[PDB]
C-alpha cells in the first residue's frame, strides 16, 4: 500500500510544476496524467478565512496581485492570473494556455479529483493561521477522505502533534530544513516516529549514513526538491522511499530501477 516502506512514491511538488504553473488545477491534472502517486499542496488563508492553495504568504510571485493573502478576500484572489508569471519566468517553457490560470481553493482541488488523487498537504505552525488544521480536517472529511489517501506535511512539530491527536490515523511527515537534518540524531527520529510516519528533509543534507539512520526507525523518507536525474538515482540507491519532485514523469521513469 501507499505507506509501505517498500513502495517508492512520486510526489508531484506543486503538481507538475516543472512544466505547468505551480499549484493550479492544470498542474495537478498534468501530474495525474504523468502517473504521480501524490499531488502536493501548500495552504494559505484569505482575509475571509478561506483556504487557498499557494506556496508563499504573499500573492506577489505567482500572480498579478500584490500583498499578503490574508489581507485579501477569496473573491478578489479568484480574479487573479496565477499562470502568466510562469511564462515570464521560464520563456522556453511558456504556453498560451497558462495565461489566466486561477488560484484554486483547497475545496476546488478536492472536488476536482476526489478519491482519484492522493494528497500531500502542508500545514503551518498553529499560530500562523488559527483554525487552519481544523478547517483542513473538516474539508477532508467533507470529501470522505478520512490510508495514504492524504499525508500531512509540516515544518511545525506542534502542528503535526495536533493533527495526530485530532486524527490518529492521519499520516504525517516531519519536514526538515538542511541544518536540522545535518544534526539529526536517533533520539530525535524516535521522537518523530511517535506522531509521524516519515521525514522530509532538504535532499542536499542527505548522505548514505543518515539515510540509513532514518530508515532504521522504520520512517518513510521523502526528500525535497529533487529535480535532477543524477540526484534521483543517488538518493534511491542510498534508500529514500520517494521524493518531492517538480518533474514527476522523470522520477516515474527513474524509480523503475529501484
Ligand atoms: Ca513543498
Ligand atoms: Na507578480
From Swiss-Prot:
Binding site for Ca(2+): 40, 42, 122
Keywords: Calcium, Cell wall biogenesis/degradation, Glycerol metabolism, Hydrolase, Metal-binding, Secreted, Signal, Stress response
Cofactor: Ca(2+)
Subcellular location: Secreted
Gene3D superfamilies per the UniProt record, alphabetical: Phosphatidylinositol (PI) phosphodiesterase (3.20.20.190)
A biological process term (GO) from this entry: glycerol metabolic process
GO CC term, one of those recorded: extracellular region
Function: Glycerophosphodiester phosphodiesterase hydrolyzes glycerophosphodiesters into glycerol-3-phosphate (G3P) and the corresponding alcohol. Involved in wall teichoic acid (WTA) metabolism during phosphate starvation. Catalyzes the degradation of WTA, enabling the utilization of WTA as a phosphate reserve under limiting conditions. Is highly selective for the poly(gylcerol phosphate) WTA backbone and catalyzes exolytic cleavage of individual monomer units. In vitro is active toward the WTA oligomer mimics glycerophosphoglycerol (GPG) and bis-glycerophosphoglycerol (bGPG).
Listed name of the protein: Glycerophosphodiester phosphodiesterase
Amino acid at each position: 500500500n501507499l505507506l509501505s516502506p517498500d513502495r517508492i512514491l512520486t510526489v508531484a511538488h506543486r503538481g507538475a510544476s516543472g512544466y505547468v504553473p505551480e499549484h493550479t488545477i492544470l498542474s495537478y491534472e498534468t501530474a495525474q496524467k504523468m502517473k504521480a502517486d501524490f499531488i502536493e499542496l501548500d495552504l494559505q488563508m484569505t482575509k475571509d478565512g478561506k483556504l487557498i492553495v499557494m506556496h508563499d504568504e504573499k500573492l506577489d510571485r505567482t500572480t498579478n496581485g500584490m500583498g499578503w493573502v490574508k489581507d485579501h478576500t477569496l473573491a478578489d484572489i479568484k480574479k487573479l492570473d496565477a499562470g502568466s508569471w510562469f511564462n515570464e519566468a521560464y520563456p522556453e517553457k511558456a504556453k498560451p494556455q497558462y495565461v489566466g490560470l486561477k488560484v484554486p481553493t483547497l475545496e476546488e482541488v478536492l472536488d476536482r479529483f476526489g478519491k482519484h488523487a492522493n494528497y500531500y498537504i502542508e500545514t503551518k505552525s498553529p499560530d500562523t493561521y488559527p483554525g487552519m488544521e481544523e478547517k483542513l480536517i473538516a474539508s477532508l472529511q467533507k470529501h470522505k477522505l478520512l490510508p495514504g489517501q492524504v499525508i500531512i506535511q509540516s515544518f511545525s512539530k506542534e502542528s503535526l502533534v495536533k493533527v495526530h491527536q485530532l486524527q490518529p490515523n492521519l499520516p504525517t511527515v516531519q519536514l526538515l530544513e538542511a541544518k536540522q537534518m545535518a544534526s539529526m540524531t536517533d533520539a530525535a527520529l524516535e521522537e518523530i516516529k511517535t506522531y509521524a510516519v516519515g521525514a522530509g528533509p532538504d535532499y542536499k543534507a542527505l548522505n548514505q549514513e543518515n539515510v540509513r539512520m532514518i530508515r532504521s526507525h522504520g520512517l518513510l523518507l521523502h526528500p525535497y526538491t529533487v529535480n535532477n536525474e543524477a540526484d534521483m538515482h543517488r538518493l534511491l540507491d542510498w534508500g529514500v522511499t520517494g521524493v518531492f519532485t517538480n518533474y514527476p514523469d522523470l522520477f516515474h521513469k527513474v524509480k523503475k530501477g529501484y
